[PDB]
Amino acid sequence: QVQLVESGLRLSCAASGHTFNYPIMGWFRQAPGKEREFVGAISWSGGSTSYADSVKDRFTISRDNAKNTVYLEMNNLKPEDTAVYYCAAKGRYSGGLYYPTNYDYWGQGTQVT
Amino acid sequence: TTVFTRILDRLLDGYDNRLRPGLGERVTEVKTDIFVTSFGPVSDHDMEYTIDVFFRQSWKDERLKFKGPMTVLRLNNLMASKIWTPDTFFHNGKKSVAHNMTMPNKLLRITEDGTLLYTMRLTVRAECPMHLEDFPMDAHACPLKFGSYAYTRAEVVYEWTREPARSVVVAEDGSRLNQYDLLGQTVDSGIVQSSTGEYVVMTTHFHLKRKIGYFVIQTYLPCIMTVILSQVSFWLNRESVPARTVFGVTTVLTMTTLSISARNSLPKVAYATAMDWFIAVCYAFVFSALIEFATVNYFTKSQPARAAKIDRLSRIAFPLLFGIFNLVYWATYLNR
Amino acid sequence: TTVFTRILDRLLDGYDNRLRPGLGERVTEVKTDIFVTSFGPVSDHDMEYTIDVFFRQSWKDERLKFKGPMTVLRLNNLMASKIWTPDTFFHNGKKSVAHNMTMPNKLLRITEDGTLLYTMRLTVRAECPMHLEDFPMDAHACPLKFGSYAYTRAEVVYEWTREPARSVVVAEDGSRLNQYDLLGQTVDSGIVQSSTGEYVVMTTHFHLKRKIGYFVIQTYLPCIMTVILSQVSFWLNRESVPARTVFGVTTVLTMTTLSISARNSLPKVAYATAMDWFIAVCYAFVFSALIEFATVNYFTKSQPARAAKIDRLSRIAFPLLFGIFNLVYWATYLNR
Amino acid sequence: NMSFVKETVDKLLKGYDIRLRPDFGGPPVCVGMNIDIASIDMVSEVNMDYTLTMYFQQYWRDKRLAYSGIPLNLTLDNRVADQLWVPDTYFLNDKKSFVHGVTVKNRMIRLHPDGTVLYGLRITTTAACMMDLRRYPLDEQNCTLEIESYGYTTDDIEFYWRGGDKAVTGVERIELPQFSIVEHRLVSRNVVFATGAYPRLSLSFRLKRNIGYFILQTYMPSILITILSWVSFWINYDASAARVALGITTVLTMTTINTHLRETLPKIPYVKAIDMYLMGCFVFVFLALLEYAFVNYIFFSQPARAAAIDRWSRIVFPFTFSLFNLVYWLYYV
Amino acid sequence: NMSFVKETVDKLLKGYDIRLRPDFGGPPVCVGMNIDIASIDMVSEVNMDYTLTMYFQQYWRDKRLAYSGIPLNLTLDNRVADQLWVPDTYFLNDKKSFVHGVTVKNRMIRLHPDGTVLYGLRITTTAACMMDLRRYPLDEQNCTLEIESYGYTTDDIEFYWRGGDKAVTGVERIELPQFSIVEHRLVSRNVVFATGAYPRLSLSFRLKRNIGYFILQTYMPSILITILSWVSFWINYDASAARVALGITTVLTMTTINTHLRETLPKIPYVKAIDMYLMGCFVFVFLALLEYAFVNYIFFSQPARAAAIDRWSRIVFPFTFSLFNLVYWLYYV
Amino acid sequence: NMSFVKETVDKLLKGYDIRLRPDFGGPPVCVGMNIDIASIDMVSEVNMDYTLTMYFQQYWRDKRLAYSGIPLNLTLDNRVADQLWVPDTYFLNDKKSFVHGVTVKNRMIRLHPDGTVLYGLRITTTAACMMDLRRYPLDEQNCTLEIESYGYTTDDIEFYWRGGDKAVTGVERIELPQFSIVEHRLVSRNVVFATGAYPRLSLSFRLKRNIGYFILQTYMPSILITILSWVSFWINYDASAARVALGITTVLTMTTINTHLRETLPKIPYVKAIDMYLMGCFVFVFLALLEYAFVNYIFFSQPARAAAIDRWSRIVFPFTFSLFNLVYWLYYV
Ligand SMILES: *[C@@H]1O[C@H](CO)[C@@H](O[C@@H]2O[C@H](CO)[C@@H](O[C@@H]3O[C@H](CO[C@H]4O[C@H](CO)[C@@H](O)[C@H](O)[C@@H]4O)[C@@H](O)[C@H](O[C@H]4O[C@H](CO)[C@@H](O)[C@H](O)[C@@H]4O)[C@@H]3O)[C@H](O)[C@H]2NC(C)=O)[C@H](O)[C@H]1NC(C)=O
Ligand SMILES: *[C@@H]1O[C@H](CO)[C@@H](O[C@@H]2O[C@H](CO)[C@@H](O[C@@H]3O[C@H](CO[C@H]4O[C@H](CO)[C@@H](O)[C@H](O)[C@@H]4O)[C@@H](O)[C@H](O[C@H]4O[C@H](CO)[C@@H](O)[C@H](O)[C@@H]4O)[C@@H]3O)[C@H](O)[C@H]2NC(C)=O)[C@H](O)[C@H]1NC(C)=O
Ligand SMILES: CCCCCCCC/C=C\CCCCCCCC(=O)O[C@@H](COC(=O)CCCCCCCCCCCCCCC)COP(=O)([O-])OCC[N+](C)(C)C
Ligand SMILES: CCCCCCCC/C=C\CCCCCCCC(=O)O[C@@H](COC(=O)CCCCCCCCCCCCCCC)COP(=O)([O-])OCC[N+](C)(C)C
Ligand SMILES: *[C@@H]1O[C@H](CO)[C@@H](O[C@@H]2O[C@H](CO)[C@@H](O)[C@H](O)[C@H]2NC(C)=O)[C@H](O)[C@H]1NC(C)=O
Ligand SMILES: [Cl-]
Ligand SMILES: [Cl-]
């Protein structure tokens, strides 16, 4: 079991528990009229980040295993970036990296305007 | 020769090899017997053994009755693929080989009353679960179980061709064992149950006893020699402090190396074997000899008489106790 | 498309692929060339090497003439299984692989005049007998020989496509060699006679020269440092008997361990390599230093002047003799 | 009457298209699974995988194979499987699998009158299992088997465990040398790739490692060498050769024990629990050698202080080693 | 209706020549590639290769397979792939490859109404990778996969990464204990052989080696042995046996470390970074032994000079070792 | 005239029944065999087997294949072997075998006008050879190849060596690093099993091991350590540390040599010749250490007796070692 704690512009996702069975953390945002949208993903150990097109060169993701945290730094915001943000954990054999269905443990929603 | 071709064409005319003989009318009975041409090496690390066999099955198929100038047709083995055959498999097999050099190592014979003899040459790797508490003085009963994969007991049954004890025959020169000794085999049959039904199982247990000589000249003798070497130190004069220290440290290091090296061809079992107990006692003796030297050296320049007495007493006590331990240990394990 | 389908169906109508082109009329001439994409590792223990090639064969089949809009049909390699092809094999091959991922790595092209180009991608493990008397300063000529398995020289002959030197082509960045350098290759052809007749054989020798750096820092340097360490003992004073004994004992033990361990890579040939001679001489030096210490210790208390003189002369003699030996050894085995 | 059975089976396979799934173009075909675990042979930290042999049974319904007039299950020769549609099931985390083929292919085909097909295989599979070795050898692992459709999405095929949690049997009989199976779990879910959504069955085992081999193999030698190093404190400080021999022997034995430990594991980049214990022991033996160095250095001019240092080291080293063992064995158990 | 689809597929395969590529005799057929990486099992320096497992997807258009009247995409049983034309794609640097075949061959065929074929395989390949080990264990490697057409030249066939930079996924699934993935790159080009020009796709990864294991198991033992060799400077010069034992043990242990470490790698001729470090440590321990040899040589006639030499060695050896470590770790990091 | 040859060949296979041997229902068909041995690879004691590569040719007559009007021997494409009857020859003591398949299957079918078939294969086989290692490494082994018919008894088939004692060629050109082939033998006999009597051909080689490797590797180090142990007798008895170091080192090194050697061979329970030599050397070094212990025990009250014991050891140990070597090498050579 993995417990995800959301804080935070900069959003912090601090995970506790079985982070070895869920080696990937991903970020999503939900618009008021649209479905959940993938933002980026970070590997706990490999530090190999992946980003969506709409936030390339603008959002950044970093990981530190000292206290098991992943940071999403948002820069150069736009009015089309007003969505409730979520952080999630993905299993080792859970499939595609861009689909919310494949993520098991979801954090608390965070609002950004 | 045309007569036999016409006979074979008529036998196979309309034949359906998807159906067992007697389907919907009676159970198919298969008589089986095994000729071991070599009982190959046993692998302790993998808990498995290899066996090379002629596997022989025989059964009745009324669809193959014929009448001709001969009473037995000894056919090319390709005919085996044209008729129905039992789907026998080894339950504890791991990765077996049906030999195909230079041709498939199979034979098929048809008697005019419809009896089929079907023989194949196999190399079977089979699981032998071993308990190694008594290692290296352990004995094992390695099994070989086989039966039908798809047909329950209401459809196919297996029987040994002759008396069960005479249906598994081991060749007289067919022994590839280096570490074990084959004492005999026990033959039996029974019923297994699974989610798909009830099946017949034929079982053979081969009785193996480990030969001890390798471990005598590899582990036991060096341990004994190290204990004797450590006890040689009791006769050096008490002034020779570096010499007796060298004796102690070298014998303890040798004992540690032997203890670590003892388990190298074995699985990482979680319990202690007999060899482990022997090595632990030898280590205790060596360590106690070094402690004896430390005690003797402590009293050398203040109570020299006590140090001399301790040395003289040790010179008798250590060998006598080691001999008694060896008697008890070997009597316990060689008489079990 | 249907035009080409009809052409292919007409080529294969009444075509017997059991018969070589020109059977009973003339000799089938096969032109061959090789493109080496990687010259794989050489194994001294197994006396073999690995090579990855595009193997190209070309011949003429009058039965496959056609007339159409295109001049060359570049066909799916399935077609190659429906026509005659040569039965080429590698005489000194051990176990080769015709690559099959994701499809058979084969290509067939048919020209309108009846000329066939047939190419396949192979990994060949071949035997390379090695003479290791000069190891590790040795050089080898690893052969690759191929020819027809079943057709004698009266039915099939092999020729190199272009001039023999230019027919085997090695890629620039296709070296998977670790401890060898590929100096070049020679290309030749000939006749070999066996129980079934005379056959054409094509041969390519690859010339390899071993690099020595690994063995220089793995065997030669530890031996030289051990000899220098043993000669350090001559400078300790004569009162320190345990120190000089420790020097001699540890250096002799190190030399024994190096000698035992230096032959791990090689096969167990029944002769002495150059490295064996070097290690033997180093062992002699270390043993001679220990013997010199024993002689000095023996005369220490009775003839101190002689012991001092022996130590003084040894301090000069041993390094000089080791330097002279090293000069002779390396001059002999480097300008061979 | 075998001729009627033959005619019926010929009729079932008349015009049968194996390229099409049952109910092609309609609702998804449901496939039930069960597994009988015959054995779990070897678990490898070096290769990060485990081997498993099983009887794998798939169950579905194909109305093209319904027959009447024969009140029997029809067990057919397994080669009929080459003339039927079967699901394209595979194991995602496997590295090398095979179906046993002696004496024939270990395959079973059983038809039922309503069209139900039972398809059974005996499979040996090596499967990947990434292991967390931070608490090795006091660690606990979770090894899975992932079962998926390869070509068909959830619109064409559905998986389910046949019998719920009773669908996997034979786990309680498994005996492993180094491990014990604490628990096994069954999960069913959907997985989305770029090519669509696919059904997924997961079977997971939790393995706890047995400690006895490591007590006999690495911990006890380290403890005994550390104790051996303390004999130096009871030898007179002027016996330099003896005490230096003790220190050197203990350091060499520590290195030898560590190398024999590391020769059996993958080259992971972090510190394990056994590594922590071994370097604690190394610190202890090195400190004992340094204590002798200090005593030998100062004893020429201050014999009393050297005697006091040796006497206090007689007590301090056992006490601190016991404390280190207490902390280590309380933090990891 | 299953029979209508059955006759549609029968019509598709009627008159189909598998010996001919799509648009044979015309413009080249374009093949789009996707790769979904499942894992990299191992990276071997001794064998100079690496093992990769992946879903390999090929996309093309065959006008002979176009169908109408069914507004659906036909997911067919993979055995139908034996009746279709497929590209003759191969991997040039591969040494041993297989398609997984349990429970069936891990293969996928999906047809689209206009004639588009999607063809998927699950492949494990051991591919060659020549490694430069001059900076080992602080080295960085580049391992590639070369995808090519065997028989068809650029006039017959074209390759392209389908989706551009997004054609390869699953790079974050690569979990190697001894490496981390820094970057991956996609390349498209042509290669000229004596038989013509062929399309070539290239997928490369940059591997960075993790230093933790070598710090734990190689560098620290050498540092500790070098430090242990300095204990001789603090022992009185009358203890010839003790100091000689210390020096000899350190020298031989350093040589043993070097030989044991080098025996586990390919027999390359050049010197690696770890070799240079070990040789520097050997020089230090050998010089400490030589220092004691000189002091023992001179101390019976010049005790003050010998005492001064030991006193200065105590300070000098740690200082020069620190300088050596500073220079080494600055040059290689 | 390929048309007429094609007509003839198609005529031959028209009514051919591959299920029946030639002369089915009549006298046994005779099969002559010859072998061209290309190489003998690894002769393993650990695996108790050897590897052989050979050209295996079988010769028989099938009157169904006679043809007229073509004054040529017809070499056919090797795949025609799949339509003719061939003998079911197998090797009884073979563990793993294969026919080479690059570039094609290494198979030859050659027909003759009277119906004679020559059938050739190129085969690599690992064959079991149980070795008696009691005299190792001065041992001589006998390794065989057993050629038999699987299904056909002596009433259907009979084997013979074609060409008498010249049926096997290439033995005299084999080069083995560790052995030399003293002799080869050919035997023909019958074997009875429960299913009848079968023809058997036997090809045996007698291998003599070369000793130079073992002189370099095992005997010489043991001799050198034994001589090293005698240096103690020339050191005065009051130097306890030096002599004890020498004796302990020799004893432990001899034990290490023996245990290291014994792990390159199968775990046989008996004593080999090299084992006896090493045990004798151990006895010698142990007795030298015991001599020093006795001298050290009685050199205070009786120094002259101790000096005499050392002086006698200096002569007795070399002389007795020479006698032991003489007896050993006369017994085993
Ligand atoms: C590269 O090349 C290798 C061979 O060098 C291929 O491996 C062979 O693949 C073929 C085709 O799939 C196999 O042949 C077929 O085997 C079927 C049975 O397979 C099972 O049993 C065999 C052993 O008997 C196992 O090896 C195998 O894994 C399975 O467990 C048969 O049913 C097939 O015959 C059918 O069709 C013929 C058509 O004429 C009919 O006559 C038959 O009655 C039957 O209906 C067929 O024989 C072959 O066994 C494989 N060999 C090996 C050693 O694996 C690779 O697949 C190939 N790779 C690529 C990518 O092309
Ligand atoms: C080894 O490690 C693996 C992970 O790597 C563990 O696997 C997880 O196991 C847990 C169960 O312990 C799984 O959780 C369960 O998943 C079920 C399936 O969920 C799918 O379907 C639902 C919709 O029905 C979707 O929302 C979801 O996204 C999935 O697609 C759920 O049905 C279960 O719910 C049950 O429990 C919850 C509370 O936990 C209740 O609220 C529900 O009502 C219901 O009772 C549950 O969530 C988890 O999915 C597994 N992960 C993976 C990746 O497979 C192994 O357990 C572990 N092995 C051992 C021995 O511990
Ligand atoms: C460089 C060398 C260094 C090493 C040192 C060299 C020294 C050289 C000196 C001498 C060399 C001696 C070599 C002897 C080898 C015998 C092997 C043998 O034939 O075994 C036989 C059996 O063996 C037994 O039955 C005996 C087992 C018990 C041994 C007890 C020892 C007691 C020691 C008391 C000490 C008291 C001390 C008290 C305090 C002072 C046969 O073996 P097997 O066929 O495998 O067995 C069949 C097993 N099975 C029937 C169950 C299947
Ligand atoms: C912890 C470690 C412990 C060990 C100690 C550490 C010590 C640390 C200190 C120093 C270490 C120095 C290491 C250098 C390594 C170089 C490697 C190299 O590339 O060599 C190259 C040079 O090789 C040649 O040219 C071959 C001949 C060598 C002769 C050496 C003579 C020594 C004599 C001494 C006499 C002393 C007498 C003293 C008397 C008082 C190898 O060339 P290559 O191209 O690879 O091979 C040829 C290939 N070809 C055939 C295709 C052309
Ligand atoms: C076909 O093969 C047979 C058998 O080898 C050949 O017959 C032998 O030919 C050689 C030729 O030098 C003669 O020396 C032998 O005396 C012949 N033996 C017999 C039994 O005839 C025959 O010549 C071959 N035919 C062709 C056309 O090559
Ligand atoms: Cl055995
Ligand atoms: Cl190489």
Asked if residue D6 has its Cβ within 6 Å of ligand 2, the reply is no
Alpha-carbon gap, residue E136 to E178, rounded angstroms? 12
Q: What is the CA radius of gyration of chain A?
A: 13
> Quick one: which ligand is closest to A2's CA?
2
Alpha-carbon gap, residue D228 to B287, rounded angstroms? 8
Write down the CATH number for the domain with range C2-211.
2.70.170.10
Cβ-nearest to D130 among A92, A95, A102: A92
**Same domain, yes or no: E145 and E293:** no
Per the annotation, binding residues of B are: 56, 119, 235
Assign residue E58 a region (left: φ > 0; alpha: ψ between -120 and 50; beta: otherwise).
beta
Say whether F190 sits in a helix, a strand or coil: strand
Residue F195 marked in a binding site: yes
Cβ-nearest to E78 among D88, D267, D293: D88
Q: Which residues of F62-80 are buried (b: 16+ CB within 10 A; e: fewer)?
A: bebbebeeeeeebbbbbeb
- CATH fold of C214-334 reads Methane Monooxygenase Hydroxylase; Chain G, domain 1 (1.20.58)
Please, what sign has the CA dihedral across residues D189, D195, D196, D198? negative
Alpha-carbon gap, residue C233 to E211, rounded angstroms? 40
Q: Is the CB of residue F130 less than 8 Å from the CB of residue F199?
A: no
Q: Is the CB of residue B121 less than 8 Å from the CB of residue F164?
A: no
Domain count of chain F? 2
**Same domain, yes or no: F155 and F76:** yes
State yes or no: chains C and F have 3 or more CB pairs below 8 A. yes
Query: Which of F65, F73, F111 has most ligand 5 atoms within 8 Å of CB, for mutation?
Result: F73
Nearest to C88 by CA among C48, C129, C128, C59: C59
Alpha-carbon gap, residue B314 to B320, rounded angstroms? 10
Asked if residue E278 has its Cβ within 6 Å of ligand 4, the reply is yes
> Quick one: which ligand is closest to D121's CA?
1
The token pair that represents D2 in the structure block? 């075998």
State whether residue E103 sits within 8 Å of chain D by CB.
yes
DSSP label at residue C193: E
Residue D195 marked in a binding site: yes
Q: Whose CA is nearest to atom 18 of ligand 2?
A: D189
Please, what sign has the CA dihedral across residues B308, B311, B314, B316? negative
**Same domain, yes or no: F242 and F158:** no
Q: How far is the centre of ligand 4, averaged over its atoms, from the C-alpha of C212 (Å)? A: 8
Chain F residue at shortest CA distance from C80: F104
Asked if residue B149 has its Cβ within 6 Å of ligand 3, the reply is no
**Same domain, yes or no: E89 and E197:** yes
- 3-state DSSP percent of chain B in helix, strand and coil, to 5: 35, 30, 30
Whether omega for the bond prior to residue B250 falls within 30 degrees of 0, making it cis, is no
Map tokens 């402690």 to a residue.
B291
Question: For the domain that residue F249 is a member of, what is the CATH number?
Answer: 1.20.58.390
Q: Which residues of D207-228 are buried (b: 16+ CB within 10 A; e: fewer)?
A: bbbbeebbebbbbebbebbbbb
- F209 φ, ψ to 5°? -75, 145
* Domain boundaries along the sequence of chain A: 2-106
Chain-chain contact of B107 with F25 (C-beta, under 8 angstroms): no
* Interhelix angle D240-262/D273-298, nearest 10 degrees: 170
Chain-chain contact of E75 with D152 (C-beta, under 8 angstroms): yes
Asked if residue C216 has its Cβ within 6 Å of ligand 4, the reply is yes
Domain that holds residue E155: 2-209
Q: Is the CB of residue E61 less than 8 Å from the CB of residue E22?
A: yes
Q: Which residues of E213-238 are buried (b: 16+ CB within 10 A; e: fewer)?
A: bbebbbbebbebbbbbbbbbbbbebe
Any idea what the Cα angle at residue A73 is, between residues A70 and A78, rounded to 5°?
140
Q: How far is the centre of ligand 3, averaged over its atoms, from the C-alpha of C254 (Å)? A: 31
Q: Is the CB of residue F81 less than 8 Å from the CB of residue F119?
A: yes
Domain-ending residue, one of E165, E185, E209: E209
- A109 φ, ψ to 5°? -75, 140
- CATH fold of B2-210 reads Acetylcholine Binding Protein; Chain: A, (2.70.170)
Q: How far is the centre of ligand 5, averaged over its atoms, from the C-alpha of C197 (Å)? A: 11
C-alpha distance from F2 to closest chain B C-alpha (Å): 30
B305: buried, middle or exposed (CB in 10 Å: 19+, 13-18, 0-12)? exposed
* Single-letter code of the amino acid located at A41: A
**Same domain, yes or no: D72 and D202:** yes
> Quick one: which ligand is closest to C317's CA?
4
List all residues 6 or more positions away from E100 whose beta carbon is below 8 Å from its beta carbon: D90, D94, D97, E106, E122, E123, E124
Q: Is the CB of residue C200 less than 8 Å from the CB of residue C150?
A: no
DSSP string, D138-194: S-EEEEEEEEEESS--TTTEEEEETTGGGSEESSTT---SSEEEEEEEEEEEEEEET
Cβ-nearest to B4 among F25, F195, F290: F25
Q: What is the CA radius of gyration of chain B?
A: 32
The token pair that represents B7 in the structure block? 């006979």
Alpha-carbon gap, residue F287 to C306, rounded angstroms? 32
**Same domain, yes or no: F159 and F217:** no
Assign residue F170 a region (left: φ > 0; alpha: ψ between -120 and 50; beta: otherwise).
left
How many of the other CB atoms lie within 10 Å of CB of C199? 22
Nearest to E78 by CA among E52, E116, E117, E39: E117
Alpha-carbon gap, residue D50 to D42, rounded angstroms? 6
| B86 interaction partners in chain D (CB closer than 8 Å) | 103
Chain D residue at shortest CA distance from A21: D142
Alpha-carbon gap, residue F76 to F223, rounded angstroms? 64
Alpha-carbon gap, residue D64 to D82, rounded angstroms? 16
DSSP label at residue E177: S
DSSP string, C91-149: TTBSS-EE--SSS--EEEEEETTSEEEEEEEEEEEEE-----TTTTS-EEEEEEEEEES
Q: Whose CA is nearest to atom 15 of ligand 3?
A: B217
**Same domain, yes or no: F271 and F167:** no
| E172 interaction partners in chain A (CB closer than 8 Å) | 24, 41, 43, 46, 48, 50, 97
Chain A residue at shortest CA distance from D202: A93
Map tokens 């022996």 to a residue.
C310
**Same domain, yes or no: D201 and D233:** no
State whether residue E38 sits within 8 Å of chain D by CB.
yes
Question: Which residues have any ligand 1 atom within 6 Å of their CB?
Answer: C 100-102; D 82, 99, 101, 105; E 99
Question: For the domain that residue D200 is a member of, what is the CATH number?
Answer: 2.70.170.10
Alpha-carbon gap, residue E228 to E220, rounded angstroms? 12
Alpha-carbon gap, residue F65 to F14, rounded angstroms? 11
**Same domain, yes or no: D18 and D134:** yes
State whether residue E97 sits within 8 Å of chain D by CB.
no
List all residues 6 or more positions away from E119 whose beta carbon is below 8 Å from its beta carbon: E57, E58, E59, E60, E81, E86, E107, E108, E109, E110
Domain-ending residue, one of E209, E244, E266: E209
List all residues 6 or more positions away from C282 whose beta carbon is below 8 Å from its beta carbon: C223, C224, C226, C227, C255
Say whether D86 sits in a helix, a strand or coil: coil
Alpha-carbon gap, residue C297 to B98, rounded angstroms? 72
**Same domain, yes or no: F223 and F196:** no
Any idea what the Cα angle at residue F52 is, between residues F51 and F53, rounded to 5°?
135
**Same domain, yes or no: E200 and E95:** yes
Please, what sign has the CA dihedral across residues B282, B286, B292, B295? negative
Any idea what the Cα angle at residue C199 is, between residues C198 and C200, rounded to 5°?
135
* Single-letter code of the amino acid located at F115: G
D301: buried, middle or exposed (CB in 10 Å: 19+, 13-18, 0-12)? exposed
**Same domain, yes or no: F94 and F226:** no
Assign residue C22 a region (left: φ > 0; alpha: ψ between -120 and 50; beta: otherwise).
left
Domain-ending residue, one of E209, E241, E265: E209
Q: Where are the beta strands (DSSP E) in chain B?
A: 28-43, 48-60, 72-75, 88-90, 97-98, 106-111, 115-127, 139-148, 156-160, 168-170, 180-194, 197-210
Alpha-carbon gap, residue F160 to E320, rounded angstroms? 81
Q: For chain C, give the longest Cα–Cα distance.
A: 112
Alpha-carbon gap, residue E285 to A29, rounded angstroms? 61
Alpha-carbon gap, residue D249 to E316, rounded angstroms? 27
Chain-chain contact of A101 with D192 (C-beta, under 8 angstroms): yes
C-alpha distance from E76 to closest chain C C-alpha (Å): 20
* Domain boundaries along the sequence of chain C: 2-211, 214-334
List all residues 6 or more positions away from E163 whose beta carbon is below 8 Å from its beta carbon: E34
Alpha-carbon gap, residue F141 to F176, rounded angstroms? 14
Write down the CATH number for the domain with range A2-106.
2.60.40.10
> Quick one: which ligand is closest to C198's CA?
5
